[model samples]
Target: MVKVKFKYKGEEKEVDTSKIKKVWRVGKMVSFTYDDNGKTGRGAVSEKDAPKELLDMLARAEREKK
Candidate 1:
C-alpha cells in the first residue's frame, strides 16, 4: 500500500494511499482522495507507488491540467 506523511493545517498527517479513490497532478503538485468503505479522506502523492486507478486518473488529467 502507498502511504505518505506531510503537514496540513499546521499539523502533521499520515495517509494510506491504498484507499485513494482519485488523484490529480499539476506540475510537481499532486492531490488524491481516499475511501475507507465509503468515508472520504484527502491528501497528496510523492515518493510512493499509488494504486493503478489513482495514478491512472492523474495520468488522464495531466494534459487537461496543462
Candidate 2:
C-alpha cells in the first residue's frame, strides 16, 4: 500500500495507505482516495456524515459497511 498524509478536524497527520481502500464499499467511502505524485492512497473515515440519502439502512446493509 502507498503511504500518505491523514487529516482530521483541522489537523493533518501521516498514515499508511496499504489495503485501506474498501473498494467493495464503493459509494460508501468517498474521498477515501487521494493521489501523491502518481501512486494512489486510501484512508479510513466515519460513515456518520454520509449524505442524507446514503445514510442509515442502505449503508448499514452492505456486507462490509463502514
Candidate 3:
C-alpha cells in the first residue's frame, strides 16, 4: 500500500496511492479521486506541499494518460 503525505491548511494529510482511482493535474495543483471505507473520496494538493514520492507518482500517472 503506497502512501503519500502533504499539508493542508497547516494540518497534515496522508493518501493511499493504491486506492487512487483517478488523478488530474492543473498547473501546480493535483487533484485525485480515491477509495476510502468503500466509498469514493476526492482530494487536492499542491506541488509545493507534496513530498517527492507523491510527485513521482503523479508524474507516472500523468504519463500513463498519453
Candidate 4:
C-alpha cells in the first residue's frame, strides 16, 4: 500500500494512499484520498497542491497570512 504523508491545516494525517482515490491534479484543483484501516476520507488537497478554484481562496489566505 502507498503511504500517505503530508501536512494539512498545519497538521498531518497519516493514511494508506492506496485505499484512497488517486491524486487528481489539475492546474489549480486537486482531489485525493486517505484511508485508515477500511474507512476512507475524501478531501480537497491543500492550496499548495490544490487546483485553481481552491488556490484562489488559498492565495488570499496565503497573502494575508503570516
Candidate 5:
C-alpha cells in the first residue's frame, strides 16, 4: 500500500493510500477521507508539505473520475 506523511495542525500524520476513500483539493490544501480500524477518518495537508507520490496519486484519481 502507498503511504504518505505530512503535518496536520502542527503534528505529523501518516495515511495509507489503500485506505483512502476520497480525496479533494482546495486551493493549496488537500483533504481526504480514509478508513482506519473500521472507522472513518479525515485529514488535510498543504500541497507544499505533501510528497510527490501522494500528489501523483491524487492526479491519477482525479483523471480516472471521467
Candidate 6:
C-alpha cells in the first residue's frame, strides 16, 4: 500500500492508499476521497489538497478496486 498527504479539519495528515473506500469529484471544489476504516473510522481528503504521491496512489487504488 502507498501513502498520501491531505488535509483533515485544519491539519495535514496521511493515510493508507488502500484504505480509501470512496471517491467523488466536485468540479475543482476539491475532489473527494474517504476511508471506510472498517466502516467505523471515517476519513476524508480533497484532491486539491492531496499531494502528488496521493494522486499516484489513487490510480493504483482504483485499478485494484476491480
**Highest lDDT, which number?**
5
The residue ranges of model 4 lying beyond 4 angstroms of the native Cα positions read 28-30, 36-66
* Candidate 3 Cα misplacement greater than 4 A, ranges: 1-13
Where model 6 places Cα greater than 4 Å from the true spot, the runs are 29-33, 39-66
Q: Candidate 6 residues 1-66, lDDT tens each?
A: 566566667776677756665554455433445554544334455666666665665566557743
Q: Each candidate's TM vs. the true structure?
A: 0.54, 0.28, 0.65, 0.39, 0.71, 0.47
**Model 1 alpha-carbon drift over 4 Å, by segment:** 36-38, 45-57, 60-66
The lDDT ranking, best first, is: 5, 3, 1, 6, 4, 2
Ranking by TM-score: 5, 3, 1, 6, 4, 2
TM-score of candidate 3 against the unseen true structure: 0.65
lDDT of 6 at 62: 59
Each candidate's number of clashing pairs is 0, 0, 0, 5, 0, 0
lDDT of 1 by residue, 4-65 (tens): 56555666666665666776775555787777467887676562544565566677766574
Output the TM-score of candidate 6.
0.47
For model 4 the TM-score comes to 0.39
Candidate number with the higher TM-score (5 or 6)? 5
Q: How many backbone clashes does candidate 2 have?
A: 0
Per-residue CA lDDT of candidate 2, range 10-44, in tens? 56645444333332244544345444346865543
Query: How far in Å is the alpha carbon of 65 misplaced in model 3?
Result: 5.5
lDDT tens digits by residue: candidate 3, 1-66: 567665556777678887778777888898877886789877778778666666777788868843
Taking the tens digit of each residue's C-alpha lDDT, what string does model 4 give over 1-66?
434455657777655544554455455545566555567676555446433444344444446634
**Candidate 2: residue 66 lDDT (0-100):** 46
Go through the candidates in order and give each one's C-alpha lDDT. 0.63, 0.43, 0.74, 0.51, 0.78, 0.57
TM-score: the better of candidates 2 and 6: 6
Identify the runs in model 2 with alpha carbons over 4 angstroms from their true place.
23-30, 33-66
Clashing pairs in 1: none
Query: Model 6, poorest ten-residue lDDT window?
Result: 23-32
